[PDB]
RNA sequence: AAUUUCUACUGUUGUAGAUGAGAAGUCAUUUAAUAAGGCCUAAGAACUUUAUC
DNA sequence: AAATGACTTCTCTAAAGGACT
DNA sequence: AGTCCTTTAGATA
């Protein structure tokens, strides 16, 4: 029995379930008969393109605004300072000088946008539909963009020019309402809520803040590292980006090029408001390409980088700046050169033939071919025909590549010439070949005779270079053919997987050529002027060999302008919406507003029905209707409901219409008028808010309840409410207004009305279904179908948990893949799983692969609401803390971490810190198939690496990871409600992912957790499901705890002996041979002890260097340990590679002597670096095999019987490896929590962070 | 190898588990290309920093 | 540049009211 | 005047 058994009905929560429509009878004919689907197929398309032809508007009104916002030095001056104070700082007076601060700004932002013309009809009828003879805002300006030649739709394909997006938006004339949630979405983007959609959040929480951190970055720049930016380079490189209109300290008027100390005064931030002003800020950070350049043009972040790098000062990479991010709906266009777009399969072959076709045709001004110059060159320098102190390697990688591609090896090259010359310094830029040849030879004295280099290696790996030339002579051949295959406008055929063939000749080609320019680049010689040294070369090489390289480097726009095409996704039909000609179709189940919201549901025979009415037949349910036909057939729904009570009874009973039947007194309306009923309501537009006053309130509220008993129809929801003095704030009682407004009833009409309705076309009839309505269906049901089923229960009715919701849609989708049939009907199927006691199956009927969609179909998503009368659990954390604090006794921690062998590893452990449970999670249960998913994963993962390098379709990798996750979600929910666990977590495409995404789904299951073999009205039914973590809002909001789910810092929880504690806090890496002597006369006593065979290492952690390590330790050398490099792993003994150490050098300990002294008299240098190897081969716990094998975890501290932790040799309730021990010391973590959470006294507040000393005390006093 | 949809199936016109949609915006990452740089916490069958796209 | 993945916002309404036929 | 699309009403850590 759980202790959890509270932990239900908690919270609301919202869903949807989605289900297939099946067309009833004559529906579907009839559908057809009158185009609907074709009409609103196109409906999607030109709803689409009239939301771009708004978003264009948008475009223009945000500019317009951010034109003419100034946010005063003085408030961006407050708002630095208290932000930079809050930093070193987290006093409560702060933290709301901070929120005002911010509050400032944003609400002057606001006004200036409130205060535009534009604005008022941005998000209304006037924007597209204007009345009366009124025109339409974005109709004039559309016409006022005509009229001074603006093309706004040069920039999208599906919009010819202005008068088709004018065309567009008139189409849509009795429709304003259809664009709501488009509305929403737009007004989200000027809210000065704390939203991250909006223009204001992106200025003033996003872009101040980065822009305020570049500030400080900058001045600690320039008093750390002041020669690191050129300045002088930076005013020419990038002088467009520097220059500004208005300097915004002096308020100077005048256009020019700014200085960097006054782009970061923090009153030029109204410069870099805008998208244009985002742009140039973040230029001036990170640089440009320019055209016709070689080198890239520099940013601030460049030069801090390469400074570091010049005197290697790693702590200047903490002034990194941090780029601004965009305006919202703004387009980016880049101040770096723009290459040309290829837009169909006859760019493609047209680009190409244009290229190869010069690389054939170009003749130096010798006359010679590319191919004859290159052969003429190199079958030249091969004979020694050159004066190889005229020709020169560039000094750079591509010498660094030469070497590792002729000898296997870097450097060959490289450090022959550091040695010959030695035989102060600079880097020189280019080296001549005859240097080349003279250090290297040199270099082979040196190098063993097998091991030897030639430089004729490397002349032999230049004559080779023509061959690429009639490789691709031949690879132009074939492509031929291809190029005519292809050579259509606009057909883009490529991008198909039916063209994956092609495409890789296509690849193939261009990498050859791409891969033949840069062999030869060792050779050019460029024009960037530095002449600060210049050679003396060759000057007939150099001549037509450049003008070989320039034709050749045209390679590097041709190669990225096809990958920028070849990997597109093709373009693929997806569903659409069906609206019967109906823009508010199913916004509102109410029977008030069936005739408006044509939907409606039906009951039979255990079966679920959507009917949709005919526009022109919309009265065909009314009461009348109803009467005149009631019979046994289908039992339509009835549907009343009462929402948003706050803001439904103020606008009825306080209407013009009704106000005076209502009649509130003169003290209700002052009530109403200063919402005094509300601690913080709006009070009526013109009026003071004044106080919360509860006598106030529960006027209004008496003056609602008497309100309700007048109303015509509410009264029939027999509401029942508690005694108005019972109520302490008007939200419990709108909430018992919403929970009772709400109600399910049933009609029977006859079945012939039905049919005769659907017949004729003026219903639109579907069963609503999924596989369990299957007359076959005899298994456990999906969730989502008893969650649907739930809905119409009178189980439910009774006392409702599940409530429908408006604002249903429905889908459309065509068939998307042939209709081929994988499994005829009684021929034999094979088995998968080689455990099956069948190893082949056989079916009276055909099987046919991804049926679904082989044919047309619709589709209903249907929104519900689960917990309808449940209160939000403000307090949930601390609900959960107090069960767990009273029943702290019978809780396990089930805590579950990661690593390169394992998607994820558990271990469920006691109260006590044994383990009861651990394992992998990479293999499943219980499933039948034994999958691996860890091989699974990383199979899909290798794939997609492949598919990107070739240009061939990214296939998904998320749907895999849910699959299996979804699997890994369901034992974990068993295993907490079995065990009264508590779920623990450490702190923090690659799969680390997949733990991130464990989490996710876990926490959302444990918001609504039902067991399908519960019954409907017990602990974990569907009517009462478990709630065990916290309602999900964000990350940030939600902490450390959500729930019985905790987050505990990761740190030392792999690497740690599970017994002592112990863990290496060393770090004994060598580099001086008095601080390894100072390292080690730093002990207590270094020892030998042949009473067990093995050396002993005393010492206490604080009298070294880190005084964060606490206590005394003795380590031993007992045992095995392994090693990798590269040629794999191998086994050492540490005590007694020990002896080897102590036989050069005559060391002697073998009757028990404290062998401390002699180690410190010592100073050959590597009689250390294996003493200083051998010691941290001693603390390496941790020691895997590259193996299938897994790894061990072995510790060097014993423990009071002596004996040495090792995790092949491990009882049962330790860990069985060393995976296992991480996850373990996740779960101690956790004890210490739920020790806190135990011990904590009411009052006072549950601290949840756990510092290493905490936990170091915790982990090692615990077992002594 | 059937699905509201996803994963694994044959569990037999389906079995098991999971499944909050639609709309909007933004960020992150990967791969390629390119520029100037580091280097045997990782690596020259290169590895890698910053940056442009 | 192409691509996928992940995160944060809005809605999940009946009825009053206005414009037009 | 009746119809029907668009706007409206505005709690609660
Ligand atoms: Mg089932
Ligand atoms: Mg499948």
Not at 994 to 1018: A, P, R, T
Request: proline share 2%; net charge neutral; hydrophobic share 35%.
């Amino acid at each position: 029995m759980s202790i959890y058994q509270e932990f239900v009905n908690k919270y609301s929560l919202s869903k949807t379930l989605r289900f297939e429509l099946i067309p009833q009878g004559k529906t579907l004919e009839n559908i057809k008969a009158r185009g609907l689907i074709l009409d609103d197929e196109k409906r999607a398309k030109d709803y689409k393109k009239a939301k771009q032809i708004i978003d264009k508007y948008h475009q223009f009104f945000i500019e317009e605004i951010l034109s003419s916002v100034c946010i005063s030095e003085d408030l961006l001056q407050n708002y630095s300072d208290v932000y930079f104070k809050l930093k070193k700082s987290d006093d409560d007076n702060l933290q709301k000088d901070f929120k005002s601060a911010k509050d400032t700004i944003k609400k002057q932002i606001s006004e200036y946008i409130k205060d535009s013309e534009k604005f008022k009809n941005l998000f209304n009828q006037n924007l597209i539909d204007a009345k009366k003879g009124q025109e339409s805002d974005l109709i004039l300006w559309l016409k006022q963009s005509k009229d001074n030649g603006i093309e706004l739709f040069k920039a999208n394909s599906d919009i010819t020019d202005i008068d088709e997006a004018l065309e567009i938006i008139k189409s849509f004339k009795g429709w304003t309402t259809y664009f709501k949630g488009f509305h929403e979405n737009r007004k989200n983007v000027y809210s000065s809520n704390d939203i991250p959609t909006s223009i204001i959040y992106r200025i003033v929480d996003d872009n101040l803040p980065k822009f305020l951190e570049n500030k400080a970055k900058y001045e600690s720049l320039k008093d750390k590292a002041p020669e690191a930016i050129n300045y002088e380079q930076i005013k020419k490189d990038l002088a467009e980006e520097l220059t500004f209109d208005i300097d915004y300290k002096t308020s100077e008027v005048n256009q020019r090029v700014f200085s960097l100390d006054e782009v970061f005064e923090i009153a030029n931030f109204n410069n870099y408001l805008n998208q244009s002003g985002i742009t140039k800020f973040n230029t001036i950070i990170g640089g440009k390409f320019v055209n016709g350049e070689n080198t890239k043009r520099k940013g601030i972040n460049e030069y801090i980088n390469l400074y570091s790098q010049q005197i290697n000062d790693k702590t200047l990479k903490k002034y990194k700046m941090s780029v601004l991010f965009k305006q919202i709906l703004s387009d980016t266009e880049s101040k770096s050169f723009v290459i040309d777009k290829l837009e169909d399969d006859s760019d493609v072959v047209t680009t190409m033939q244009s290229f190869y076709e010069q690389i054939a045709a170009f003749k130096t001004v010798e006359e010679k071919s590319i191919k004859e110059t290159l052969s003429l060159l190199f079958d030249d320098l091969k004979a020694q025909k050159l004066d190889l102190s005229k020709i020169y390697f560039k000094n750079d990688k591509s010498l660094t590549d030469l070497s590792q591609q002729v000898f296997d090896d870097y450097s060959v090259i490289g450090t022959a010439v550091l040695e010959y010359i030695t035989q102060k310094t600079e880097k020189a830029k280019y080296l001549s070949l005859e240097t080349i040849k003279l250090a290297l030879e040199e270099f082979n004295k040196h190098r063993d005779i097998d091991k030897q280099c030639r430089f004729e290696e490397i002349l032999a790996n230049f004559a080779a270079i023509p061959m690429i030339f009639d490789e691709i002579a031949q690879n132009k051949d074939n492509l031929a053919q291809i190029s005519i295959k292809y050579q259509n406008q606009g057909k883009k055929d490529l991008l198909q997987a039916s063209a994956e063939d092609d495409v890789k000749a296509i690849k193939d080609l261009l990498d050859q050529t791409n891969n033949l320019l840069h062999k030869l680049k060792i050779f050019h010689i460029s024009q960037s002027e530095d002449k600060a040294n210049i050679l003396d070369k060759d000057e007939h090489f150099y001549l037509v060999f450049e003008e070989c390289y320039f034709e050749l480097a045209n390679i590097v726009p041709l190669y990225n302008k096809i990958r920028n095409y070849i990997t597109q996704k093709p373009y693929s039909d997806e569903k659409f919406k069906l609206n019967f000609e109906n823009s508010t179709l199913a916004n509102g189940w109410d029977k008030n507003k069936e005739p408006d919201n044509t939907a409606i549901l039906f009951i039979k025979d255990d079966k679920y029905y959507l009917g949709v009415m005919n526009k022109k037949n919309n009265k065909i349910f009314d009461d009348k209707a109803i009467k005149e036909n009631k019979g046994e057939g289908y039992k339509k729904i009835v549907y009343k409901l009462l929402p948003g009570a706050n803001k439904m009874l103020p606008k009825v009973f306080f209407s013009a219409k009704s106000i005076k039947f209502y009649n509130p007194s003169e003290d209700i309306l002052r009530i109403r008028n200063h919402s005094t009923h509300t601690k913080n309501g709006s009070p009526q537009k013109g009026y003071e808010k004044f106080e919360f006053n509860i006598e106030d309130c529960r006027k209004f509220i008496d003056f609602y309840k008497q309100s309700i008993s007048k109303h015509p129809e509410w009264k029939d929801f027999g509401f029942r409410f508690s005694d108005t003095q019972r109520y302490n704030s008007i939200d419990e009682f709108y909430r018992e207004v919403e929970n009772q407004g709400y109600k399910l009833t049933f009609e029977n009409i006859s079945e012939s009305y039905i049919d005769s309705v659907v017949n004729q076309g003026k219903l639109y009839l579907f069963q609503i279904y999924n596989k369990d309505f299957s007359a076959y269906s005899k298994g456990r049901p999906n969730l989502h179908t008893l969650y649907w089923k739930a809905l119409f229960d009178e189980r439910n009715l009774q006392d409702v948990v599940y409530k429908l919701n408006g604002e249903a849609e429905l889908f459309y989708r065509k068939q998307s893949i042939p209709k081929k049939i994988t499994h005829p009907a009684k021929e034999a199927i094979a088995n998968k799983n080689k455990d099956n006691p069948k190893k082949e199956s056989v079916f009276e009927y055909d099987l046919i692969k991804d049926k679904r969609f082989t044919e047309d179909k619709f589709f209903f998503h249907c929104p519900i609401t689960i917990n309808f009368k449940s209160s939000g659990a403000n307090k949930f954390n601390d609900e959960i803390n107090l069960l767990l604090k009273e029943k702290a006794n019978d809780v396990h921690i089930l805590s579950i971490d990661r690593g390169e062998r394992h998607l994820a590893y558990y271990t469920l452990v006691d109260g006590k810190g044994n383990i009861i449970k651990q394992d992998t999670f990479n293999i499943i249960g219980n499933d039948r198939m034994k999958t691996n998913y860890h091989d699974k994963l990383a199979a899909i993962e290798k794939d997609r690496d492949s598919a990107r390098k070739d240009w061939k379709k990214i296939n998904n990798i998320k749907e895999m990871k849910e699959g299996y996750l979804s699997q890994v979600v369901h034992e974990i929910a068993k295993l907490v409600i079995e065990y009264n666990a508590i779920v623990v977590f450490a702190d923090l495409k690659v799969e680390k992912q997949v733990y991130q995404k464990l989490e996710k789904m876990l926490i959302e299951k444990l918001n609504y957790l039902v067991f399908k073999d519960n019954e409907f009205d017990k602990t974990g039914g569907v009517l009462r499901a478990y709630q065990l973590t916290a309602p999900f809002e964000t990350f940030k909001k939600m902490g450390k705890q959500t729930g019985i789910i905790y987050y505990v810092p990761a740190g030392f929880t792999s690497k740690i002996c599970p017994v002592t504690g112990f863990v290496n806090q060393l770090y004994p890496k060598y580099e001086s041979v008095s601080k390894s002597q100072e390292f080690f006369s730093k002990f207590d006593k270094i020892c030998y002890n042949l009473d067990k065979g093995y050396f002993e290492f005393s010492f206490d952690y604080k009298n070294f260097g880190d005084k964060a390590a606490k206590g005394k330790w003795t380590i031993a050398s007992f045992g095995s340990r392994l090693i990798n490099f590269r040629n794999d792993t191998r086994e050492v003994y540490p005590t007694k590679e020990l002896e080897k150490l102590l036989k050069d050098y005559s060391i002697e300990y073998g009757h028990g002597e404290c062998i401390k002294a002699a180690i410190c008299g010592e100073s050959d240098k590597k009689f250390f670096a294996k003493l200083t190897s051998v010691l941290n081969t001693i603390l390496q716990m941790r020691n895997s095999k590259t193996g299938t094998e897994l790894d061990y975890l072995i510790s060097p501290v014993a423990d009071v019987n002596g004996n040495f932790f090792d995790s092949r040799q491990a009882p049962k309730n330790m860990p069985q490896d060393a995976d296992a021990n991480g996850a373990y010391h996740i779960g101690l973590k956790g004890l210490m929590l739920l020790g806190r959470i135990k011990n904590n006294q009411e009052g006072k507040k549950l601290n949840l962070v756990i510092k290493n000393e905490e936990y170091f005390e915790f982990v090692q006093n615990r077992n002594n």
